[PDB]
């Protein structure tokens, strides 16, 4: 009843839930490519297309053919050097998925200015390779998103405005923590307007970026946070030992009356410079803050820096070593940070 | 803090503030725009449209800016509005779903300060008040040059009104003492010709004749595909008395969009001087041209544009214009 292509269509649809997820996948790939410059161009807010341009390492020409194919034991076994082909691609699920539920194009180069333009069909095969030029880096273009998921596409049209803002929030997250990276975001309107949406300067402190990304009001009520949670006496599994110290740097709203937010609409948390979904740590943030200002939620921009060695259908749901202790040492450490702020 | 200085550089005067509002309404697909000044804008300026409203999702960043070839216009989302929040007090009554509406209040930084409920037809009403209040120098300048400043602003609205055949424009000024005065009014779905009469009156079409010209610039492209420019509109004839005593009615548009293109008007003016040296011509010209042939982001003025290979454009436009006038006089008798 349901043919293989459909299965591929539906599954890839489970991978790229919406425009925002697609964007996440593209930004992540660029950062992974060691880009220091990332440009994102939306056409009609995403309805038409999204383009991600970086100056990263680019894609090795040998990977072109296997970049967006889905990995199947059955098809790999059809190669003489199985070990070899499995190092030429079949990585991840993103590009492989954007192929099934969208039109994927790539322009890349590992040797500027000689470059290639690749068109991949729904199944990962290269329908056309065109000679072109471009500086070091890669450009990924996702167009006609969900063109073969009528129901989802239709929903996208009657909710594109909210979707974009959701997608913008996520772009703001990447831009605030990635100081060594310059982000630029434009939206080209059907009426021919190139509307600048967001921009940060390369080599900008988190502060300079919050101010760019949220205007002068962005810092209003904010106070620097510089904490060190010593967790060494809390590691559980016995063996130049690991220094289990967590450095928490960033900014958070001061408990001062009013200085907070009416909504928990502006909270960002990072673990080793990467947006992470720390549900637990936010709950803690919120409660500890209530005790000082009940009628408001705190704006958050905190980076948890620590060794990944002590770090373990969605994404990067991270769990730290003995998270229960962490949560407690943080709760009191922050609380006492606010108490010290009141005395100010 | 140093935010308002930046705002002041963005919204230099009343006119600029109005362009910002009018463009937003037009961008919102309104076919009805009504502008109300209270004391020529010294107290406030109200722009009401029947556009598609502001989706609730955009409220938060509505007045926030997230910063610092086949394109025709350049935009800096949030810049205009956050700048109006800076040097002034901004109010908003919008809705994408009538008959229920939201009334927003922003402070100088953009933080929403009040969101109460009301009602209105589909659309948006933007209220700008106390323009430049926190900028004394200019604030006073304004109140001391409001006449030329208002005239400069009305002329810009007159520019929009005339070319936007799909929109019904209406403009009023409420005196400090109380009653409303209709200053501008156009019926919608009207030709430039009809609008010229509505905006200026019985004598608006005086001595004006049609202009339908084509400028071929194909062989004037250096540094690099059909570079032709369809120039349509009206211009005064050169016969005695058929012109204006001054350049108070010279409008140029590029792709149905208003722009300041002095060099072209300069061309029109000097070419006209060739036949008449006591008057200037009334000009209403639209220049159709492929976007790819329009260079954007040429100066801090997000609206200022530069035509592909201007140098020649003028030259061909000047001679083409001359032939126009020569051909024109032939059928005088
Ligand atoms: N912008 C880019 N620059 C260079 N290579 C890229 C870029 N985007 C994608 N690729 C290549 O495409 C392959 C995978 O894309 P993707 O489908 O996101 O999987 P992944 O990055 O390997 N895994 P994941 O981290 O889970 O997304 C990568 O392993 C790269 O080799
Ligand atoms: N009258 C209106 N109706 C609907 N939406 C509006 C209106 N005025 C403003 N907006 C919204 O507010 C946002 C921007 O205001 P503005 O600050 O002028 O930037 P912009 O229009 O995006 N760019 P620019 O053309 O460079 O000014 C728009 O992008 C709309 O989403
Ligand atoms: Mg990836
Ligand atoms: Mg605008």
């Amino acid at each position: 009843q349901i043919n293989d292509i459909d299965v591929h269509r539906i599954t890839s649809g489970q991978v790229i839930t919406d425009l925002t997820t697609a964007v996440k996948e593209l930004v992540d790939n660029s950062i992974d490519a060691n880009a220091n410059q990332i440009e994102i161009i939306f056409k009609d807010y995403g309805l038409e297309s999204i383009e991600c341009s970086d100056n990263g390492d680019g894609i090795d020409p040998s990977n072109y053919e296997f970049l967006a194919l889905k990995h199947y034991t059955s098809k790999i076994a059809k190669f003489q050097d199985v070990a070899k082909v499995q190092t030429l691609g079949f990585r991840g699920e993103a590009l492989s998925s954007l192929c099934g539920i969208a039109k994927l194009s790539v322009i890349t180069t590992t040797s500027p200015p000689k470059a290639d333009k690749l068109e991949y069909d729904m199944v990962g095969h290269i329908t056309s390779k065109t000679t072109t030029s471009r500086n070091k880096g890669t450009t990924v273009l996702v167009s006609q998103l969900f063109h073969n998921l009528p129901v989802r596409q239709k929903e996208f049209s009657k909710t594109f405005k909210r979707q974009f803002t959701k997608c913008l929030t996520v772009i703001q997250g990447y831009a605030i923590i990635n100081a060594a990276i310059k982000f630029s975001v434009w939206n080209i309107t059907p009426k021919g307007k190139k509307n600048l949406i967001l921009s940060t300067m390369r080599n900008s402190s988190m502060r300079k970026n919050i101010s760019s990304v949220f205007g002068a009001g962005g810092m209003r009520g904010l106070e620097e946070v510089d904490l060190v949670l010593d967790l060494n006496p809390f590691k559980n599994r016995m063996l130049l030992d690991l220094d289990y110290k967590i450095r928490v740097k960033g900014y958070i709203s001061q408990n001062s009356f009013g200085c907070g937010r009416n909504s928990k609409d502006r909270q960002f948390i990072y673990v080793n410079k990467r947006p992470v979904e720390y549900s637990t740590l936010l709950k803690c943030c919120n409660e500890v803050y209530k005790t000082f200002n009940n009628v408001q939620f705190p704006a958050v921009f905190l980076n948890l820096e620590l060794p990944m060695s002590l770090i373990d259908p969605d994404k990067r749901v991270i769990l730290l070593h003995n998270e229960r202790a962490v949560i407690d040492i943080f709760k009191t450490t922050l609380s006492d940070y606010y108490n010290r702020q009141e005395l100010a």
Side-chain angles (χ1 to χ4, degrees), chain A residues 48-63:
Chain A
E48 176 65 8
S49 57
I50 168 177
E51 170 179 337
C52 188
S53 274
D54 65 52
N55 54 359
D57 302 346
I59 306 163
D60 183 327
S62 63
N63 283 181

